[PDB]
Amino acid sequence: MANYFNTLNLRQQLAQLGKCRFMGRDEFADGASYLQGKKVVIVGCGAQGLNQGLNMRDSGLDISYALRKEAIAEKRASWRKATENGFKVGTYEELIPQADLVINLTPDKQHSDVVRTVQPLMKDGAALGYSHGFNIVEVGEQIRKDITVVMVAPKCPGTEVREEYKRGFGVPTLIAVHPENDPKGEGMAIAKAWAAATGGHRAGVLESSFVAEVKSDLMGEQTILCGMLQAGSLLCFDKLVEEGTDPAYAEKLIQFGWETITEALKQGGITLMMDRLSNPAKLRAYALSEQLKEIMAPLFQKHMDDIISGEFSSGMMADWANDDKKLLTWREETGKTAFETAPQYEGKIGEQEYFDKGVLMIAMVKAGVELAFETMVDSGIIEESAYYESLHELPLIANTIARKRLYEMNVVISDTAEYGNYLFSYACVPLLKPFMAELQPGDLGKAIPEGAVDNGQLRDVNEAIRSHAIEQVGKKLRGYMTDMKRIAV
Amino acid sequence: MANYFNTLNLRQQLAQLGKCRFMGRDEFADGASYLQGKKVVIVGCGAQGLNQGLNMRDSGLDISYALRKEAIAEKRASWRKATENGFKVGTYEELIPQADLVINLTPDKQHSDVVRTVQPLMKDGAALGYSHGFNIVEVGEQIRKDITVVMVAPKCPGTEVREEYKRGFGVPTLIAVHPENDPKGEGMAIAKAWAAATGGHRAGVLESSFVAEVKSDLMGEQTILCGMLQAGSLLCFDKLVEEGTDPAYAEKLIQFGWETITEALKQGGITLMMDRLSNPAKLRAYALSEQLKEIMAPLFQKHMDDIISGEFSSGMMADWANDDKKLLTWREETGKTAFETAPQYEGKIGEQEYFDKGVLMIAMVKAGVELAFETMVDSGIIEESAYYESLHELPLIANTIARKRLYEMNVVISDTAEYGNYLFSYACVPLLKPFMAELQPGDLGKAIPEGAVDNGQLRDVNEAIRSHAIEQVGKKLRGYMTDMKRIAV
Amino acid sequence: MANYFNTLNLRQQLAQLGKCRFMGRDEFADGASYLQGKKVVIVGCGAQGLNQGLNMRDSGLDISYALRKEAIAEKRASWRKATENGFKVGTYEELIPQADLVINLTPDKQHSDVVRTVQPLMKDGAALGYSHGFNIVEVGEQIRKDITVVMVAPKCPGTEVREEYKRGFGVPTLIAVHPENDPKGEGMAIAKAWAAATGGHRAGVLESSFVAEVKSDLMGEQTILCGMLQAGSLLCFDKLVEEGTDPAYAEKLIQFGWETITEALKQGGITLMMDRLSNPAKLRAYALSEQLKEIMAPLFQKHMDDIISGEFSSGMMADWANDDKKLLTWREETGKTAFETAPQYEGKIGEQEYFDKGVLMIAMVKAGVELAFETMVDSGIIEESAYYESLHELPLIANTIARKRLYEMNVVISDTAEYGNYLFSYACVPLLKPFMAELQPGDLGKAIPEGAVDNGQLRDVNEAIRSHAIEQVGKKLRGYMTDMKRIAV
Amino acid sequence: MANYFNTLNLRQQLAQLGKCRFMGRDEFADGASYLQGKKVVIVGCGAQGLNQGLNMRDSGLDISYALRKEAIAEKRASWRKATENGFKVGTYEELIPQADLVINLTPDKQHSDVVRTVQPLMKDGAALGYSHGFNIVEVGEQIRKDITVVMVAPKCPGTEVREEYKRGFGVPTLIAVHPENDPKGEGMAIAKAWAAATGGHRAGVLESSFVAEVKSDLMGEQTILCGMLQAGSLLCFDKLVEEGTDPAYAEKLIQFGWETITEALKQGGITLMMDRLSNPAKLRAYALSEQLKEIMAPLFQKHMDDIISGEFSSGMMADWANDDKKLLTWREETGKTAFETAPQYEGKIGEQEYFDKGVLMIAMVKAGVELAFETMVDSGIIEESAYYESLHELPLIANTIARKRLYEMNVVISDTAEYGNYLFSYACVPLLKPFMAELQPGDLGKAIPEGAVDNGQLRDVNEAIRSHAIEQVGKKLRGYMTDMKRIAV
Ligand SMILES: NC(=O)C1=CN([C@@H]2O[C@H](COP(=O)(O)OP(=O)(O)OC[C@H]3O[C@@H](n4cnc5c(N)ncnc54)[C@H](OP(=O)(O)O)[C@@H]3O)[C@@H](O)[C@H]2O)C=CC1
Ligand SMILES: [Mg+2]
Ligand SMILES: [Mg+2]
Ligand SMILES: [Mg+2]
Ligand SMILES: [Mg+2]
């Protein structure tokens, strides 16, 4: 079971790495029709499985859920959810053999066990679907030649997928067809119909590839999404305490800061997030970010490089086979950090206060997101892909920390993201120690007084921020999506 | 002699009004060589005359000054300056008859008397140069058919055209050829060489026309440049005083405020000027500006329309023929004004304070500048011309007020600009009275406190500011010009 | 009843002349809804009236036809067509008083008589609709203040309007709202709904103005569409005969040539039409076109100028009031020309033969269409407008000539177009006499031998053709429309 | 010494492969001044060496030639040429030790022996220049760390770089700095001054890299430039003969056909080359080209992949070490070929006849050029590089065949290009056998008659031709270069 990406030569790798194309609304004229009157069987009934299923049934598709025998006998939540929503439910043996499309909506770490049990039961020329590409790409799962393999990957959790669909809208979605498995050349038609049936074509669909989705997803989560938020949380909390800030106040500042500042990010990219600062604070935030980018570039590059080479996934899967020893160890250490155990301040912290007292947090967001984006683009990944696996997802991850700290983040995300996070975090914390030691008053925990700044410098900083390539694609893609949302009224 | 613009039909008017083309560097490969070995004679040795002459001689041209006999006999400053700097000086009869190029650098109000005295002395196929097109366009001066008529109009005062040249640089420059007077088709060759001899091709040269230059200049100066600064100065000082501001402090606020805020405008357009405010102050300046634009639009449109139709210049020239009765009456009334007679505070007003306490002033600049620009573009004038006759020139006019108040502005500018100012200002002041009566705290004379603002609103305001056509063309032009500067130095 | 365009000042004229905006498909989300449950009454039941009505009824609107009392009593075709299609039919008195939208679909020359009879019967706040703007713009018809005046103008004859609608598609359409008559500000909503109900939003809708539609329509028909085709037909037929070509063969060459060559024009603009020639023939066609453009420019300019000034329509309406004396005289002379009376060749003329024997015809098409376009754009009209009133309409007019010669063209088109045609034709024929006298072998009636040409010249000619502004907007607009058609499948 | 490209990971490879930036004129403001007062020593006085040296001395640089002692003693042409032209000439020991810049202008196959002999003589911090990057990239030559390593690669033969310079012009030029050897960060300064001293900045200079230059050069030469011309020459001559064409006439058709059709390619890209055909012939060349591309794509991709992986150059260098056994065997077999031994017709073949009777040849140029370009761009090479190593260079290679057939091409080009050619050609010939067997009349050796073609099809073919990425970038680059020429002359 060799890593699939590694069986490809440079030209072949680039061809897939660079696959990303925001699709025309027109391209989905046939809607879900191609799948009408065919048997669609979802494996598992979890977050994505139930919610994609609800949407697809509403779109006219025949959906049923294949569960393990013991899931049915034990009345697992999956079986209860499926049956209470009036779906047909059965065993692999009763449902897989007739299925035209088998949709694998189980946790990624489990995909080998699932695919290997399900394939032999699938009829000739049936299609196998994934919502994430790790199994095909990193594991190198071999799919029987006559089977068509496709991906439809919503960029939101299942509940949002269902909710947006109900209100006549939907969620941005990525699609792909695995070229080793498109024997009848119907991959795209199946994927487009599946995507349309979940409502994706209402919000924007990107034609991509298993390889691009996987490589960019891993880079984003390891560096900016989880790695940086964890490293940043520990560094900043420790620094605040070390400089005399009340621990409970420091813990709340950090717990809710990322969420507050990334909400400006969600609304208008790095540009708006920086704009919420006073002018002198913006200039300082910009400079801190530049120093951060310079210090962290080799680390971000190492991560992209290991992701590309297969060294990342190979190393992690060795931990999987050794009972997640390293994961569990790092998770335990994480749960013992001062920030994770700190008491939480009780009084109010005003919205602007998170910005003004979090100059360094803003700079860490900017530096990490730009570095992740640049390093991906430098590795053959297209801007749009890099954007969706970095800046786009940041606010949601910030939300989890707000809910229940690093603990909540690390249980909400996949084992792959968690492991990825620790690998980065435990390198990045030591790395930034000298840097943290030289912070200046105003950098963290105290507002930098608004006031006069040099006209030229202000102009140059504003221009440097908004002209960053991630701000340009961001402004464009958010523009598309806003337009789509408006149309759906 | 009839207004020249009015002898043209719509198509012909449009062809002229819309002439404006930023010229390529390579169009000046010949430099000043077309004028080498030729006799260039400048009439009147004043601000433009001496300084353009200095540059042209340094560029290898043969430059002499033709003065009136009494100017020589009385040793006027013009005669002093020319002979001091080692130029040949003579009477019209001595120098004009052999002139290949006669450059008229006397005040615009005097052009008819100058042109009608110099024409009969000019040899066959000579050329007549202007640096402003009022005499040709509005007066309708008729120029002997064998004479070629061209314009080279630096966009900066004489002292600056000299010092930039000495620095190996130059000043943005407009050129034009009057199509009724180009019998050899050599107008453009003459104009380009004259412009290059002054150093304009080192900065940027625009191919324009007598008509576009005049109509846009008149509109910029009477609305945004002088009218709005005069109307705004009076309105704001009176309102500061009315609401309890110490008069001497109010007068300093207004006297130096325009210069301080437009320094930002100079460096980075309306964008940078607004960026200097706190976020809540910015949102409020933007709103005030929109209200202002709505209220002033009919007045601005009236001024453009009267400029287009010739009603403005005919009305003004009737005043010329009536011993400037209206001009002088308006000038006197301006001198008895509260702002013009107020004591001046000698104490300190910090740079940021002019922005923070001048929210309404900033809104007036934005509104006036945008409105003038829009109204011009709606009248067949190209963006670049509209930009150069409004936003570009505003910082210099603000500097005059900083020096010696409205008195200084009205004596520094031409009688045409001054009359235009009053005509506008005396209508705009009463027009805005209800508006001033409804100002809220923070609008003028007191800072609006920095703080939180809605994310979306801030994003949208920032986008609306920088996406304005005057901001887009301004960012482009300042770009070209900044690039050229780096080459030259 | 003063010409409306002439009551406007330059800025006001340009604002309307330049109104042209291909609209977003999204802008028509409400479809015909705004008119649902309102009373729509069409006046007349002719070509546009019946076919727009059929479409609008199918779209859910309440359509009825108001006829003159005697049209009903005499059982005119209008009454028969309306009733056989099951429409409600009545007198002005019975239908107008309750109408929410009265749609004037009578011949333009008749509009004063119609509007003046219908207005007094229209309730307060009702809307009056036109499909052509001549009445409002040139005649200056005054519409009661409370009435909303809008235009919806399909760019195809009624039958095509109905036919394209039936097959789920439609026809490119122009809309406008007369600013003197939009008291409730509902003009655009009414016009958009009317346009959508006829199917226009399926093919492309342009937001324009009465003034732009009228001025560009008149220029197109007078010069390239009818004027040039008539002048060209007479010049070429006479030249062929004069040089020995069999008259019957010459008459067929000319009768069917325009149609054949403009079919390439319809498919791919001037670019494709020229591409159908051999290389040497293309180079010659290009050169002839350049000479033509130079000879004809003053004439095309005169026509645009008279159209703009109101001199065209004023002069024509003086003929109207003098019983169309000049029209009838020119029409009679036209019917006596050699081409109009020539016998028609019986044998076959191959498709390529029309191209190869019609080098001069191709050059006349190119020169006339480019000149009409350039002259319109020079007069404040937007490219898209100029395109739709010139190149776009050429093939249809070529078709009429093919059917039944100049006679057919001049009876198919409005009296306004016919008069316009003669005014141009009778100037253009004499004008081109010297030019026709110097034609070379191959220019007309004989193929120019295919073969070698200079590489550079060929490149330059190809580039000069396809880079013409009319070829750029053409390629773009045909691209939009093709896309729209594809979507409608 | 290991292949340098292979020591890099994907990200690092991509950074190099994708380096290509057309440089601004202003980047060369300093001209050659960075090298003034320095000692420049060229090793080997051959085609590039003498001619670059002539330009550099004229540009004010201090140029001397370092020859082997035996070259001086034996009075080789190199020694003759240098002393004839008045240059200092010495041994390595005399000139190298004080050299600031040692420019290696010996044949690429000899670079290892040259570099390893010259390095030990070079003083500390000296610079080593190449004009092709094979030694650094593929051989992996290791250069003393204190030595700066740069490349200046004119895109034209030496005689042309000399004569363009004399004309005040120059030749498009690639520059690069090897990142493993830039200890003072002065590489770019050295490279830019050397390029300017040769006159490259007068035409156009691209900032590229050793890696991009090598990989693209190798790919262009073995597929389109030499391989395709050799495979095409043999295939076409044999098919002409097989089908009854007189052999001597067939050999002239092929010998001079490539040069004649690529003259059009030189002047205006594939666009102009296709335009020279009749419409029906054009449609057929286009179709043949598409079929060819489909058939050859795996072969082209194989060549790129082997070039990327190092398999090509390692395979070739094993042949170098085996006394060029494969090269010589392929060379000999090429000489016994029917085309190479055919008699030559002395009679006339008209220019247009090479196009008309060479439809297949034109299709082969189109297909090969596009395929090579596409395959390179798919491999991380930028369009501009891909353009300059294929289409740009094709006319010159065609000229060699016109002179003395495949014999002349294979002796004029390097051993690397020749070996690359054979490796490709001997696979492509048998590959295309079934294709040649199914040719239709008109495909080769006889004109396809001009005539009518479907309008839409012609439009679409013309669009597909000119919209190809190689045509778009080609039109842009030839534009820049044409503009620069006009300035210089
Ligand atoms: N034709 C075209 O290609 C296009 C035309 N248009 C516009 O559409 C409008 C209608 O044109 P079209 O359909 O050709 O018109 P028609 O010639 O087909 O109109 C026929 C109808 O108009 C009625 N009519 C004529 N004169 C009067 C009058 N004096 N009073 C009352 N009714 C009268 C006739 O009444 P009755 O039945 O009693 O005889 C008849 O019912 C025009 O403004 C035209 O410019 C717009 C786009 C394309
Ligand atoms: Mg992700
Ligand atoms: Mg993920
Ligand atoms: Mg001015
Ligand atoms: Mg002025």
Ligand SMILES: [Mg+2]
């Ligand atoms: Mg028309």
Ligand SMILES: [Mg+2]
């Ligand atoms: Mg018409």
Ligand SMILES: [Mg+2]
């Ligand atoms: Mg090459």
Ligand SMILES: [Mg+2]
């Ligand atoms: Mg080479």
